Every structure is written in structure tokens, then in C-alpha cells.
Amino acid sequence: DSSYSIDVSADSPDRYLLDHQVDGRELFPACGCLVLAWKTLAALNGRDFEQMPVRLSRVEIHQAMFLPKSGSATVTVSVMPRTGEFQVCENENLLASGFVTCPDKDVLETSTHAQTRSSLQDRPATEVLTRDEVYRELILRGYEYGPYFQGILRASVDGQESEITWDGRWVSFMDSVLQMDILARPGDYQMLPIKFQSINIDPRVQPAAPAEDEDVVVLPGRFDPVLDIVSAGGVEIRGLETISASRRLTHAPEVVEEYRFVPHHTVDIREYADACLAFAVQGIKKWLSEDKDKVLPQKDLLQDALGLANQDFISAKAALERILKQQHGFGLFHTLNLAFSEPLEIGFRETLKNKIHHMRYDMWDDCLMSAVECADSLKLCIDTVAENTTSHIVNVLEAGAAKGAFYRRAIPEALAKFSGKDYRYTVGDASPMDDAKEFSVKTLQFDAANFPASQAHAHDLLVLKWVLHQQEDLDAAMAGFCGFVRPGGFILVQEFVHRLPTLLAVEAVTDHPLPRDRVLGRYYSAAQWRELFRRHGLVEVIHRSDGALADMFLLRSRPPTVLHLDDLSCSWLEEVKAKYSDLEAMPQDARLWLVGKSDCNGMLGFFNCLRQEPGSERVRCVQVCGDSVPDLSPGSAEFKYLAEMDLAFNVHKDGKWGVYRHLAITDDQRRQQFPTEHAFVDTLTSGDLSTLTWVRSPLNLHASSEKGQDCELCTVYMAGVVSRDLALACGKLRRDELPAGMFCKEGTLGIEFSGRDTKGKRVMGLCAPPALASSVLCLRSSLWSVPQHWSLEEAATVPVAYSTAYYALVIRGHVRPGDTVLVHAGGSPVGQAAIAVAQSCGCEIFISTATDAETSSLKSMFPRLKDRNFCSCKDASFERHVKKETSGKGVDIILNCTTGELLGASIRLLASRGRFLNLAELVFSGSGRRDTSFHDINLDTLIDAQGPEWTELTSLVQKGIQSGLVKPLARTVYAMDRLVDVFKLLEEGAQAGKLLVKIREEEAEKITLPAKKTFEAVPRTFFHPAKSYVIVGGLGGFGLELAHWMVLRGVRKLVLTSRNGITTGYQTRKIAFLRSLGADIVVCAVNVTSQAAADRLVKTATDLGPLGGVFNLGLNLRDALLVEQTAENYKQTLEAKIQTTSLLDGISRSPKIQPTLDHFVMFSSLSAGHGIPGQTNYGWGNSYMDRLCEKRRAQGLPGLSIQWASIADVGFVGTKGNNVVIEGKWPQRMYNCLQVCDYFLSQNRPVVACHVLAEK
């Protein structure tokens, strides 16, 4: 137990160990455990770990320790003297094991140690990867190494020849070599090493450690793929079996949101409101009729309310009870019932008020009170305020916080999503507000006019939720509120207009009494509210209603210079550049009126970026879209109406004035299952059985034609489920473990199926994985015709069951007349199939049922079975029974299906020349029966590799079907929408025989067309393999990864267009990999700027195949403030987005390509939505692209514009470090970006956005 205490403090040597990060976690590298075992062996043998050649074999990695951010950890090492079986473990959980020894000269076997010349230099840059790209690949996979572990200086495109930087530390060097190995196997899944085969270290031949001044040593390293052996300097790693991992998003969830032009102006909420009004009216009538003790608070007020409403308790109570019954959250009625029905004796006020205070928490979340404060309206109001205040911090004050509790929904749904505009929010009310502790805010207690002068004019947004109908002197209270607001600030008001008597019942208790325009002495109408706002220097900028109770208003405290940027050739650039400095010298009461009315006027993004720059505060943008162009000439009624508000972002559309704002997309909308003609079940979050759901299938795209062999598309009617499907869905069996040919498939669940083939003839059989689906593309060789007298509910049981039975007993077991067959778990369908086959051959069968009901059922299903041929599988008793009944010889064919100690017991029953058919081996190898045989039976491999054996098996099962041998087993049909329960039951072990899923009900006729049907399924994104897609500028950083994802999703014909073509080595490696996946990548270098260039591009695409999509990913970054912006920069930036986009749009809507195009996509950036300082070219380009895509969708044809915040890894930000924050937007990962893109490609919205917020 040579314990090692590692330390990771600042001054400790091992600080570098914190550089080995894997998805934002400081994992202790396996190389560390290897080096620790090396040192332990060296110490135990009286040697130094720098001059002792070592060899670690059979190494296996169990767990990965998480290094503390700062502190120390303990790891023990326990090696055996003779065998050298080390065991590196910490605390109670083992980390790694294997054997470690010290061999003689015969330690290294590669000869790369002797080699000293590199030769990697003087090779064209197009054929060598530098450190930056070599580690860009690995960070893309998920390994994010720090500078100390970035121990690779150069690599070849083949990934074979490479250069390592030796600088003393052994762990860094070993992890560099392992990084070489990982680089040798491309992909997109976070590979995790588990088992090695041989790690030989020979420090003697290794070059000596550099001194401090001798910089580093460059060591050559080579990876031989024949044996899969990576050797650099003095190390030699071999084997490296690996598994997959499910990644771990390092940041907060991506905030998907759709751009939309938001204009200014459960139970049916109106019905709820009306019913509650009637209930309140009758309850007030009851109270007035039962007011003999004169205890009713302000009886005159409630009499007035009842009289105004006028203009049985059981009846209305039943009305509201029924309306509740037919139906989330119902608060108003519950509180009203509590209030009306309560002992009204002396002291009523305080007890009832305390009860109402208890219930206020539920009262907030009511489907009538919270009917107007939907996420949409709050986000609209808050973002309007945010983009109309010139400051990095926005102040918000909430008066009467206790009554309203606005923050409840304004902080976590409209403020917490702020990016680049910090929010300072404070509450105020005479009552304590400790309940606001969770939502961190500063408490400024007060209430009226005795208004704190400390915040005299230091607020931008004042919140008035149900606090405007409580004051008496509305004029003075308004004067105080308006004072509370900075000039140009906003006020949020939420009031009641209709159905006042209801909730007046409540206010008469909980609210302060008031005397008595004044509707009920306390309330004002909508028009009256607007009059009140008008009288007090306030213009209502937004008005939202709910039609029942509540109305929200966002109000603002009230020689123009127009500048029509109608031109799109950047003459406006010079015009505005000259006219915009004139604002600075001008007084602060004058603003610049930028007016844009063009076919695709792009001012939205341009101004969004320009706003950040200094001196832009007094600049107003006016975007005009659509016809009915408003009169924007100076002196026009529209212009007076606009200046009455003076809003930064004002847009016109459909004849109404609104604002182009972002709106969040709730998870209820990211899983809206749509109807599709084909679908297959899959697990969204791999490893969880609670997420199984139906996803659209690529067959819907008429991709049913398979190049290999001839295939037939069958319409499934009854899809079976096997233990294999559970093993895959749960996560016990990783996808990559499946045979090549099933890993590239669409899904991986379900094999058996049965239904009508083309022309309708009923068939059944196994197939590729995507069988548990509403349609399957079988290979025409795995199809048996359903006989008569066999309804499809029964044919779903023969396959897999009898297939495995025959394949085990006959094809491989070769059971003969005689011999003894031990069938474990005779209850399961495979057990019964094996019983049938074995009894057909005539052998003696020893069954091992688990329970007793299974024994009775089997005995009643098979007459010839006696009572001596049964055992108990649950416990290790079957061994005794089998050995006693068979005279100790032992059985011959053990169709075993158990594991663990039961497996050892089963192995200890096998007789000489015995065949152990393991359906699920380590113990077996140590057998003592001499001539034996062990057969691993995995039907998946046979299904994939349909050699002669598959045809022979098909023939055997068909011949059996012709006879009476095979017959359907016990079946348990489960409805379609019961996948989670079906899989859970399959996990439990209480499965009743077989398990099926009824996709479609069988019809009377025995041969007919399968009719039509639509299935609910979450839409995925798949591409037609016979089409061609162009990725303009796809050769950059994002483009390449988008192309790899595309090729994974089915694209086989690509045109990666770039400026100069292939320049670096990373592009060449990516091209080679994509072509290795079996795709046609015709890289061009056509800078699309004229009709001829685009025509040539389309000619290339068509020569590849019919054109289907165009993913424009080009960009040009000439960042510079508008005060010092040159026409050349604008031209160079727009020709990358505007010219190319316009030409592609013009050429893709021609008659010859329009009916074949479905994926016109333009990658944009948020710089058009949220602005970036001094990047107006990017903003104008992005705005134009978004407007073009909106026009496209309005006109038909596909259209899409995805606005990104910041992509990590690939971009230059990834090279400098994927942590730099811009406007508070963390650099988004890649795979998360790809998943968001996957959702975005298959949803009908013109322009969308996606950004990841950074920890403030």
C-alpha cells in the first residue's frame, strides 16, 4: 500500500495536472495511474522510476477520479510480489488494474525510439496539421487540454507521423501519445479508454529531460494502424479499447428563441371570469342578507358593488365546481370560497386577512390574474425598455411589492435572460418582504407624499402592479410616480377594468379602506386610465388586454433629420458617416432619424450594432416592411405619432407599428410531435428509459432505395420487443458495440416484425435495427410468408424466438437424436422455442423455470415433459437436480442464459464433447472436461452479415413452419403509446411471455393494401441521399463541422465552396474523413460575385445530382467603428453575404430547381439582433439575410436564418480559448450548436436565434 498523496495547490509541482480537462471536469488522467504503478514497482524493487524499463499489460481503467480545484488527494497502490498484479485505487473505488513488470532489452518493439530525424518539416502546409488544429479536433470531440498537456507540435494528415514536445513530466508525454491514438480514430463521440493491451516504457532510450534554458526536445512519433500501436520517444502504447460517453454541456442551457415582429396592439378565461363574477355577486348578496351583527367590512362599499353588478350560493358554487372539474392552477375561486365561507364573528378582519395572506401565494398563480402577464408580454415590455435606455445598468423599482409581487415573473422570465445589460431591481412597501429573499433585491420600504427623495430621478422602469387603484389622491400619487422615473424612463401598469365587484369582495378585506370616474370608489376604466396617464406626461407605448379582468400598459415619459438609407450600394455609408458626427456638436435634444424603406432594407442589424458605439444614443431607426408605406416625410401625421414616443427601434408591418423582438421557445414547443407517415421509436437522452418517443423516419423522404442487394419496404403491423432492445435503450449496451452496418443506421431498437409486404402479402421476420417502427426496409431475404390460420398478432412471436432456437440448437449446437439439453429460463420465449426444437430432435430436455406458475404452464403446453425434468433457476439448486438425475455425466447442450455465480454452476454441468451455447465465458476457459465447445450466440452479428448461414437459417425456420413444430407463444399486446411502460415491464422480469406493440389493427382481407395512417412523432432532420447540397463558404471552421453532421444525417453529395480552396491541413483531413464516410465532396473555389460564377456552381451541383439545399456560411469581419469606416470594408463584407445570397436566391427559385430545393439556409449572427460595438457590416449583412428569408417563407419555398451568438472550438475564439465572453454570451459548444441546428432545420419559422448566457 505505497500511498501517494498528490497535491494540486498553486506552488505544488502537480498544478499542471489540472490541465487535463474532459468536458469541464479536471479528471485525473489514466497516464497518471500508469506512472504511479511504475513508481510503485520501482520503489518496491529498490530502483528509481527514471531508469527502470517497465511494461504494463492487461491494463483496464475502471473509474476516473475528479481532481480537486485546490487541495490534495490520496491514491494507494497495491502490487503483488510475483505476478505484479497492481491495483491503483483511491478511497473505496478502484481506479485501474492490470499487471506491471520490468522486462529486459525486449521492451520496445516499434523502432521509432531509435529514429531521431523528424522530416515532418518541409512538407506543404496543406499536408501538415499544426498544434492549433491538432488540438482543435480533440477539443471538438470534448477533451479540452491546458497548455501543459498540449504535448503535440505537429502531425501529418494521415495522423501517423507526428512530433511531441518532451519537457520533463512523464504524464504529459504519455497523455500526448494517447492523444495521438485518439486522433487516429476519427468520429464525433467522446471516446473513453477502458482497456489497454500493452504499455511499454523504456526511459533509458528516451532523450534526457531539457534543462530550464534548453527549451523542449522534439521527439518523433508514429502510429502503426496494422497493430494499432502508438510509439513516441521511449513509450509504446497498444490496444486502447474504448467506449462512448454522453458528453456534458459545460454551460447553461442554450436559450433558443425566435425572432418575430411583435406588434403593439385551460378553461376559457372569459367563462371563468364571468362565472366568478356571478359567484361573487351572489355571495355578496348573501353577506348583506346575513349582516345582522354589523361586522361586514364597509357594508356600504359591498352594497355599492352588488348594486353595480345588478346593473343562490349552491347554484354558482356548483357552476364553478363544474368548470373546475372539466379542467393548471385555480386560485381565485378557492380564495373566494374561503372568504365567503368563514365564521364572521368578532375579530373577523384579522383572521380573514391572515388567511388571505396565507393563500396569496396560490392567488398569484391564477389563470385569471396571471392571464395577461404571459412570458411573451413581459419579455416584450422588458426588452423594449432595455433597448430604449442608454446605459449598461437598468434600474427597476416596484412600488407596492406586497400587493403585486411583479418580480415573481419579471425577474426569472424577462430579466434573468438579459445579455449585455445588467439589471438592478428594488422593491418597496411598508410591509416586510422577507419572502423576496430568494430573488436577491434591495428593499426600500415606504408608502404614501412622503416619497423617498433618495431615488428622486434614478429609475428607468417603475412597476405598478395593482397599486394604481389603491391611492386616493391619484394626481399626487401620479406626480410622485412620475418624479420617480428618470426622463425618458418607462412605467409598467397592470390594472383591472371589467368585472370589478369580483375581487372587490377581496379588496374590501385585505385592502385599505377607501371612501366612496371612481367606478366603485376605487377603480378606473381603461379609457379613464389612459386619460390619467395622458394628463401626467406619459405616452402609452404598449397596450395589452386579456378581455376578462386585467390590462397591461407600458407607458413612457414623453426639425427632424431624416436619412433615407434606401440604397443598398453603400452610398448611405458615406452619407450617414458624414451626417452622424454632426449629432455630437448638435444639442442633445436632437436625434438622427434613420429611415429605411426598401425591398429588403437591412437597417435592423446595422442599427443594432451601431447603437453600442459611442455617440449613437440620439439615433432613431425606422424599418418599413410590406405595402401601405406610411407617410414618413417630415410633417406627416405618422411622424408626429412616432415622435410622440421617440422609441429607438420602431418598425412598420401589415399597416401597424410594432417592434422586432426575440421571443423564447418553450420546451413545450421543442417537442411538439407532428403527424408523419412513418416513424420509429428512439431515446432522446441516451441511457434513460423514460424518454422513448416516436421520431420521424428517413423513409418519409423516399430514401427507401438501398444500393446493396434488393430491399422491400414493409408496413409493420405488430412490432415485437426483445431483451436486446431494453439493453440498448437502458444504456447497458453502447451503440458502437453493435456490428458495423447497424451503427450507421437510423435507430437501433427492435428486430422482429410482421405485416403486409408490397402488394399486401402478409410476411414476417427479422431485419435491420429500425424495426420497431411503422415501416421497415427489409432485405427481402429476411421475410417469411405468414400461413393461414395465423393472425398477425401471432406471427410476431415466431421470429427471434424460433430463429435463435434453431440457430443455437441446429446450426451451431448440431443437436442429434439423443444427448441432453439444459434450457435455462424455460419461461422466456427463447426457452419455449428451444424446447420445441429439442423435442423435435427427440432429446431429453432439462428445463429451469424460475417460479412455479411457469412449471405448470409449460407442463400444460408440452405433454411429454415429465415431472423429473424441471428445476429452480432462481437459486443454485438446478445444479444438484441435474447432476443427480443425469447420473453425474452432465448435460451436453447447455443453452445457458444466466450470468454470475449461476453461470459458474451451469458451466460445471457440461459433459465431455459438450457445447455451451451462451446466449448472453471467463470461468469456462478453466474447464476440466477436455473436449468441449463454447459458442457465443449473438443474433445481431448474423443479422448484419447475411452469409450462407442466414439463408440456411431462413430455410430451417420456413421448413419448420410448414410442419406443426413451430407455433406462436404467449403474447401480451401493448398499445402504441405505451413504450415506457413496456420497457419498464421488460426490465422488471415479470414479463408475460412475449411482448409486442400494436402499430395497426389487422384487417379482414388476407391480402390487401395497408391503407393510410398518420403517427405522432417529434420531427427529425434527414437529407435525401440522391440529392446535392451546396455549403457556400463551407470550408471554414463552422462549415466543415456542419458538413460532417450533414454527411452523418445522409448527405452523400456536397459542394464545399471557398475563396482560395484548400489551404491548411485540417481542411484536407476533414475532406479525407468525409470521403471515407462514403460521400461525394467536390470542393470548389468560386467566389460567387456574378451570374457566371453562380451558374458554374449550380452546374457543378447538378453534375453531382439534383440540387436540394444551399447553406450559406461565408463571412467577412472588417470590424471598425462607423466614425472611421471605409467603403472598401463595407463592400468586402457585403459581397460575402449580400451578393452571394442574392445570386443564390435568384438562381434557386428558377423553375428547374425550385421543385427540388428544400433546404435554403443562411447562417447569420446575433450582431443583427443584439448588436456588437463597431461591427456594422456584419449587422447589415445579417439583417438583409433575415429579411430575405422572411420574404421567402411568406412567398413559399423554404427559408431560414439562424442567428448565432458565438461558436466555440472551431472559431478563432476557440483557438484563443473558448471562455472569452462577448456581451455576456459564453462561447457555445459545437455539438449543442449542432443539436439546435437539427431542431431549427425542421421547423417552420423564417428567422431564429440561439445564444448561451454567461455566468454574471
Coordinates of N, CA, C and O in Angstrom, one line a residue, residues 811-864:
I811 N -27.9 -25.1 -36.1 CA -26.9 -24.6 -36.9 C -25.5 -24.7 -36.2 O -24.5 -25.1 -36.8
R812 N -25.5 -24.4 -34.9 CA -24.3 -24.5 -34.2 C -24.2 -25.6 -33.1 O -23.3 -26.3 -33.1
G813 N -25.3 -25.7 -32.4 CA -25.4 -26.8 -31.4 C -25.3 -28.2 -32.1 O -24.7 -29.1 -31.6
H814 N -25.9 -28.3 -33.3 CA -25.9 -29.6 -34.0 C -26.5 -30.7 -33.2 O -26.0 -31.8 -33.1
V815 N -27.6 -30.4 -32.4 CA -28.2 -31.4 -31.6 C -28.6 -32.6 -32.4 O -29.2 -32.4 -33.5
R816 N -28.3 -33.8 -31.9 CA -28.7 -35.0 -32.6 C -29.7 -35.8 -31.8 O -29.9 -35.5 -30.6
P817 N -30.4 -36.8 -32.5 CA -31.2 -37.7 -31.7 C -30.5 -38.2 -30.5 O -29.5 -39.0 -30.7
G818 N -30.9 -37.9 -29.3 CA -30.2 -38.2 -28.1 C -29.6 -36.9 -27.6 O -29.9 -35.8 -27.9
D819 N -28.6 -37.1 -26.6 CA -28.0 -36.0 -25.9 C -29.0 -35.3 -25.0 O -30.2 -35.6 -25.1
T820 N -28.5 -34.5 -24.1 CA -29.4 -33.9 -23.1 C -29.2 -32.4 -23.1 O -28.1 -31.9 -23.0
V821 N -30.3 -31.7 -23.3 CA -30.3 -30.2 -23.5 C -30.9 -29.6 -22.2 O -32.0 -29.8 -21.8
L822 N -30.0 -28.7 -21.6 CA -30.5 -28.0 -20.4 C -30.9 -26.6 -20.9 O -30.0 -25.8 -21.3
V823 N -32.2 -26.3 -20.7 CA -32.7 -25.0 -21.2 C -33.0 -24.1 -20.0 O -33.9 -24.4 -19.2
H824 N -32.2 -23.1 -19.8 CA -32.4 -22.2 -18.7 C -33.5 -21.2 -19.0 O -33.8 -20.9 -20.1
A825 N -34.2 -20.8 -17.9 CA -35.3 -19.8 -18.1 C -36.3 -20.3 -19.1 O -36.6 -19.6 -20.1
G826 N -36.8 -21.5 -18.9 CA -37.8 -22.1 -19.8 C -39.0 -21.3 -20.0 O -39.8 -21.5 -20.9
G827 N -39.3 -20.3 -19.1 CA -40.4 -19.5 -19.2 C -40.3 -18.5 -20.4 O -41.3 -18.3 -21.1
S828 N -39.1 -18.0 -20.7 CA -39.0 -16.9 -21.7 C -39.3 -17.5 -23.1 O -39.1 -18.7 -23.3
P829 N -39.6 -16.7 -24.0 CA -40.0 -17.2 -25.4 C -38.9 -18.1 -26.0 O -39.1 -19.1 -26.6
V830 N -37.6 -17.7 -25.8 CA -36.5 -18.5 -26.3 C -36.5 -19.8 -25.7 O -36.2 -20.8 -26.3
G831 N -36.8 -19.9 -24.4 CA -36.9 -21.2 -23.7 C -37.9 -22.1 -24.4 O -37.6 -23.3 -24.6
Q832 N -39.1 -21.6 -24.7 CA -40.1 -22.4 -25.3 C -39.8 -22.8 -26.7 O -40.0 -24.0 -27.1
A833 N -39.2 -21.9 -27.5 CA -38.7 -22.3 -28.8 C -37.7 -23.4 -28.8 O -37.7 -24.3 -29.5
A834 N -36.7 -23.3 -27.9 CA -35.7 -24.3 -27.7 C -36.3 -25.6 -27.3 O -35.9 -26.7 -27.8
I835 N -37.3 -25.6 -26.4 CA -38.0 -26.8 -26.0 C -38.6 -27.4 -27.2 O -38.5 -28.6 -27.5
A836 N -39.3 -26.6 -28.1 CA -40.0 -27.2 -29.2 C -39.0 -27.9 -30.1 O -39.1 -29.0 -30.6
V837 N -37.9 -27.2 -30.4 CA -36.9 -27.7 -31.4 C -36.2 -29.0 -30.8 O -36.0 -30.0 -31.4
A838 N -35.8 -28.9 -29.5 CA -35.2 -30.0 -28.9 C -36.1 -31.3 -28.9 O -35.6 -32.4 -29.2
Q839 N -37.3 -31.1 -28.5 CA -38.3 -32.2 -28.5 C -38.5 -32.7 -30.0 O -38.8 -33.9 -30.2
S840 N -38.4 -31.8 -30.9 CA -38.5 -32.2 -32.3 C -37.3 -33.2 -32.6 O -37.5 -34.2 -33.3
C841 N -36.1 -32.9 -32.2 CA -35.0 -33.8 -32.4 C -35.1 -35.0 -31.5 O -34.4 -36.0 -31.8
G842 N -35.9 -35.0 -30.5 CA -36.1 -36.1 -29.6 C -35.3 -36.2 -28.4 O -35.4 -37.3 -27.7
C843 N -34.5 -35.2 -28.0 CA -33.6 -35.3 -26.9 C -34.3 -35.1 -25.6 O -35.5 -34.7 -25.5
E844 N -33.6 -35.5 -24.5 CA -34.1 -35.2 -23.2 C -33.8 -33.8 -22.7 O -32.6 -33.4 -22.8
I845 N -34.8 -33.1 -22.3 CA -34.7 -31.7 -22.0 C -34.9 -31.4 -20.5 O -35.9 -31.8 -20.0
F846 N -33.9 -30.8 -19.9 CA -34.0 -30.3 -18.5 C -34.3 -28.8 -18.5 O -33.4 -28.0 -18.9
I847 N -35.5 -28.5 -18.1 CA -35.9 -27.1 -18.1 C -35.5 -26.5 -16.7 O -35.5 -27.2 -15.7
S848 N -35.3 -25.2 -16.7 CA -35.1 -24.5 -15.4 C -36.0 -23.3 -15.4 O -35.6 -22.2 -15.7
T849 N -37.2 -23.5 -14.9 CA -38.2 -22.5 -14.7 C -37.8 -21.7 -13.4 O -37.3 -22.3 -12.4
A850 N -38.2 -20.4 -13.3 CA -38.0 -19.6 -12.2 C -39.0 -19.8 -11.1 O -38.7 -20.3 -10.0
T851 N -40.3 -19.5 -11.4 CA -41.4 -19.7 -10.4 C -42.0 -21.0 -10.5 O -41.4 -22.0 -11.1
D852 N -43.2 -21.2 -9.9 CA -44.0 -22.4 -10.1 C -45.1 -22.3 -11.1 O -45.4 -23.3 -11.7
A853 N -45.6 -21.1 -11.3 CA -46.6 -21.0 -12.4 C -46.1 -21.3 -13.7 O -46.8 -21.9 -14.6
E854 N -44.8 -21.0 -14.0 CA -44.2 -21.3 -15.2 C -44.1 -22.8 -15.4 O -44.3 -23.3 -16.5
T855 N -43.8 -23.6 -14.4 CA -43.7 -25.0 -14.5 C -45.1 -25.6 -14.9 O -45.2 -26.4 -15.8
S856 N -46.2 -25.1 -14.3 CA -47.5 -25.6 -14.6 C -47.8 -25.3 -16.0 O -48.4 -26.1 -16.8
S857 N -47.6 -24.0 -16.4 CA -47.9 -23.6 -17.8 C -47.2 -24.4 -18.8 O -47.8 -24.9 -19.8
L858 N -45.9 -24.6 -18.6 CA -45.1 -25.4 -19.6 C -45.6 -26.8 -19.6 O -45.7 -27.4 -20.7
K859 N -45.8 -27.4 -18.5 CA -46.3 -28.8 -18.4 C -47.6 -28.9 -19.2 O -47.9 -29.9 -19.9
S860 N -48.5 -27.9 -19.1 CA -49.8 -27.9 -19.8 C -49.6 -27.6 -21.3 O -50.5 -27.9 -22.1
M861 N -48.5 -27.0 -21.7 CA -48.2 -26.7 -23.1 C -47.4 -27.8 -23.8 O -47.5 -27.9 -25.0
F862 N -46.7 -28.6 -23.0 CA -46.0 -29.7 -23.6 C -46.3 -31.0 -22.8 O -45.9 -31.1 -21.7
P863 N -47.1 -32.0 -23.4 CA -47.5 -33.1 -22.6 C -46.3 -34.1 -22.3 O -46.3 -34.5 -21.1
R864 N -45.5 -34.4 -23.2 CA -44.5 -35.4 -23.0 C -43.5 -35.1 -21.9 O -42.8 -36.0 -21.3

